[PDB]
Design an enzyme around this catalytic site. Structure first.
Site, short mmCIF file in Angstrom:
data_model
loop_
_atom_site.label_atom_id
_atom_site.label_comp_id
_atom_site.label_asym_id
_atom_site.label_seq_id
_atom_site.Cartn_x
_atom_site.Cartn_y
_atom_site.Cartn_z
N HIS A 1 0.83 -1.19 0.00
CA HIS A 1 0.00 0.00 0.00
C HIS A 1 0.87 1.25 0.00
CE1 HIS A 1 1.16 -0.40 4.23
NE2 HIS A 1 0.88 0.88 4.37
N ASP B 1 0.80 4.96 1.76
CA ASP B 1 0.12 5.63 2.86
C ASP B 1 -0.89 6.69 2.47
OD1 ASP B 1 1.43 4.19 5.06
OD2 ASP B 1 3.19 5.45 4.75
N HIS C 1 4.82 0.18 0.21
CA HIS C 1 5.61 -0.51 1.20
C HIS C 1 4.82 -1.60 1.90
CE1 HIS C 1 3.89 3.00 3.29
NE2 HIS C 1 3.80 2.19 4.33
N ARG D 1 4.90 7.08 13.70
CA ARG D 1 4.93 7.61 12.34
C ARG D 1 4.51 9.07 12.21
NH1 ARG D 1 1.03 5.50 7.74
NH2 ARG D 1 0.03 7.55 7.95
O1 LIG Z 1 5.20 -1.22 11.13
C1 LIG Z 1 5.87 -0.83 10.19
O2 LIG Z 1 7.17 -1.02 10.11
C2 LIG Z 1 5.23 -0.05 9.09
C3 LIG Z 1 3.77 0.26 9.19
C4 LIG Z 1 3.26 1.04 8.02
O3 LIG Z 1 2.90 0.63 6.93
C5 LIG Z 1 3.14 2.58 8.18
O4 LIG Z 1 3.51 2.96 9.29
O5 LIG Z 1 2.69 3.16 7.18
FE LIG Z 2 2.08 2.24 5.61
#
Ligand SMILES: O=C(O)CCC(=O)C(=O)O
Ligand SMILES: [Fe+2]
Ligand SMILES: O=C(O)CCC(=O)C(=O)O
Ligand SMILES: O=C(O)CCC(=O)C(=O)O
Ligand SMILES: O=C(O)CCC(=O)C(=O)O
Ligand SMILES: [Fe+2]
Ligand SMILES: [Fe+2]
Ligand SMILES: [Fe+2]
EC number: 1.14.11.17
Lengths: 273, 273, 273, 273
Positions: free
Chosen positions: D95, D97, D246, D261
């Site tokens: 996906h 983000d 990712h 994040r």
């Molecule tokens: O948990 C992770 O390393 C990534 C999670 C993810 O896709 C995001 O934080 O957009």
């Molecule tokens: Fe993500």
């Protein structure tokens, strides 16, 4: 008197000459066993009336009233399918009639009321033959799995009323039916999923269910597994909705096409051995 | 005299009543334009002879002699398809007759010699309709690409003689034909790949060609794009092999089935605008 | 002395620090059990020689001489993979080393001789994990089937010499290996088909085999099932070729890349319970 | 001072050594151009705080507050991803983000707070490289099409609150984004659909959109198009969310994993030439 039955192929399909005025027990018995030996039967030159069709339908079992499609004059058991520009056709897809109910109909009766120049063709594919065509390992793999059927798949929300819709929805939630069904009467084995309502095989990984349904939705397409009927006015189609899927061509617009359907309730689908 | 032409659907297909004794120029003109308006035409009650069929074939163009299938008595232009247990059917697949030659046949004539109880059914799908059904962006994407056709795909080595085979192979190497063909006569646009011989679209990545052919081989399956014919003795089938694909059901064994085919050569397939 | 083992993930993969001069029995035992617990192991800063690598390889079992790839100076057991413009890379695909022989290698040793700026990356996917990820019904369906492997799939004729080719071909005809293999030593269950050589599952219909392989060839792609290694000079890779597949990125041309491989023969793959 | 940048592959990916205390304009400029040359960058040994991360995020552009995921203590711009048994991971899918908003984020910052034994791995695939890999005819076919993105695809109703959900839904209806996006800054061309949210390409038939997305969702999987990162505490990941997808491995349960994040808003995606 004996009925004239001409089989349309080695598997599914056949044509007859009776007299639909009510049937003499003895004939209805030949017809029944006909609609059983071949999954579909066709009769021409039968200008019946709604009240008259519903009568014939009852001769098989209790009826069903569709929660969405409109009904005839004063006969709610006989669905009226009037297609045209202001109401495009929505049966141009492989499906088995009403499988989003615990006890999906074991049969239906279609009356060719008003037809277009040509087209409108309808095909039926045999689940029994389709099943016999599966390699042994596949028959094992499939026999026993369960698949979810959702009325909302073939009747999405966006196409709707939206109050009459929500009503039919809540009253017909998604449920499970065996991927391989055993015939109540014949006891023959047959595939029982249909692109129309089957959403996923609940007993395998999402990607697995996805892979298997792609195969199956295609598998049932094989020409050997089907029969095609070129409609003609006052034609009559009777089929065993518990071991077949059918498709109705959408190639007659802007013209109009009128069909009457008698939906007949059946028992609960189950698998055996 | 005018011919009786009954169209079997909005697109491909139709049935006629003429008199196949040679045709009166004026009729052959109606027939030709018939086999052109509908991609396939069917005639019943025409008990012709090999020599007699080849005659009719010539009326369209030079003939073709198949490098593998066996020929009739003293008529090498008329292929004999005698199927049974000692020679199973190999036409139960969507294909367009002989596209592994630079100038694939623009037509063929099938004579229903000896038939089985039922089955053996044959269907034809229209490339023209299939093409009109592609979204614009797809029509663009496809119009212009070239696809490789390999005689060895529908006639693998292992099924063979292996000396007579190698001969036909070297004499018919894989070649290219446009993915979207323009009709020599009608000038209409049509898809021109067939699961039978098309190996890959040479003008895209392997995975891309792979993806597109899966779609297309399926796309041409849509029931709206076809016609189905239930064989009857001394039946005659004539079709435009340059804008159609056809399938012949393999569901009559162990019984026997005999068919005669007149293969007619056409020009070189090309695309335009 | 104990070896430093750092696991690269919950499943497949790990990194170590030993001393490759020959190994002290006691260490080779730790390494072996390492290359067994994780399907792949990586060692850096090990500037060995061909003669030296083959020595290490033997410590596991008899070796194998590839019938196509070129060998080192005076060591035919050590394959030399020198890639560049005049010899593009052909390992950018999921495959399990040499499965077109009755007794496919149970291991191999890769030496990073000369590397490009970056890229050339190589990944390994675990058949054991991939198998544990299959729903029960699928494990049943797969456990027991057999799949054909053909050396010609990953070494087509057209890319070739054509006399040295035909030789290796006739000497390595297509054969069968169980779709689900049981580990000779660990006895763990694992998927055993690889896009590289597996042509079709011989125990299901053509369309069925086709459907299952699409799923499987994809299934083994899931990131959770793998490890990725960014090459560095004098790096050493040792993996259990009987329960893994691996891919080598083709993204370093026109630059050059040199790798040495020690192929180690294993027993005959078999399934159990 | 110059930053130490080590590229992880020919395309996407790289690792750096700076000093995250705020950045000296001159460095942030090197970093920015870094997170631009390689789509993703990784920094280790950076034990920052929520307040501290959000600061760094702002240095790129305004932030975004996720309508579903929970936020940090007193920093709503910094999403907290705490996974375990009572809250399984939902990012194990390709996906990009937040693309269900008119102006999807052009970047994000991930902080490895608390990690599990191993696993949890995260990969990034490059849309730019994936695009360059499309044959010309495909680039044409794709460049210009529009695809629908639906927040409900990656955040279904059944997994939910159901009042807080409906709220985020109505406030984030499905919308359209170009299938091929042009980079606001680099101006490079890149594929812009992601299995995570893309529901169908609105400018082609349902079956066509279906076929193309299957290809694309797979196409972006090619190992050559990606980078894989093995998490380590206090690690920092910064990537250009407008030309990448990712995946985050779900293979660490029952253990716990905590990630912070910083979501950064970008302009409106558009195509050019
Ligand atoms: O948990 C992770 O390393 C990534 C999670 C993810 O896709 C995001 O934080 O957009
Ligand atoms: Fe993500
Ligand atoms: O219109 C038709 O011929 C058939 C419609 C249909 O699928 C049905 O009535 O169940
Ligand atoms: O047997 C048939 O009806 C048709 C065989 C066929 O494909 C052909 O003759 O081209
Ligand atoms: O070049 C590489 O890193 C690996 C090549 C490969 O697949 C092999 O050596 O089996
Ligand atoms: Fe129906
Ligand atoms: Fe044919
Ligand atoms: Fe290999």
């Amino acid at each position: 008197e004996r009925l004239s039955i001409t089989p349309l192929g080695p598997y599914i399909g056949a044509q007859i000459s009776g007299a639909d005025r009510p049937l003499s027990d003895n004939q209805f018995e030949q017809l029944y066993h006909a609609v059983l030996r071949h999954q579909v039967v066709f009769l021409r030159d039968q200008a019946i009336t709604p009240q008259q069709q519903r009568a014939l339908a009852q001769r098989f079992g209790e009826l069903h009233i569709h929660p969405v499609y409109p009904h005839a004059e004063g006969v709610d058991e006989i669905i009226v399918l009037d297609t045209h520009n202001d109401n495009p056709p929505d049966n141009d897809n492989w499906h088995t009639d009403v499988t989003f109910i615990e006890t999906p109909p074991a049969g239906a009766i279609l009356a060719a009321k008003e037809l277009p120049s040509t087209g409108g063709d309808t095909l039926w594919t045999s689940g029994i033959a389709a099943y016999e065509a599966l390699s042994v390992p596949f028959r094992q793999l499939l026999s026993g799995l369960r698949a979810e059927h959702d009325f909302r798949k073939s009747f999405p929300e966006y196409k709707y009323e939206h109050q009459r819709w929500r009503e039919a929805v809540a009253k017909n939630p998604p449920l499970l039916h065996p991927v391989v069904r055993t015939h109540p009467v014949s006891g023959k084995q047959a595939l029982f999923v249909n692109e129309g309502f089957t959403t996923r095989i609940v007993d395998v990984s999402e990607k697995e269910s996805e892979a298997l349904l792609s195969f199956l939705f295609a598998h049932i397409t094989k020409p050997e597994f089907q029969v095609r009927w070129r409609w003609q006015p006052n034609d009559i189609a009777i089929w065993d909705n518990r071991v077949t899927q059918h498709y109705a061509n959408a190639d007659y617009l802007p013209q109009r096409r009128i069909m009457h359907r008698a939906t007949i309730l059946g028992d609960k689908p189950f698998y055996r051995a």
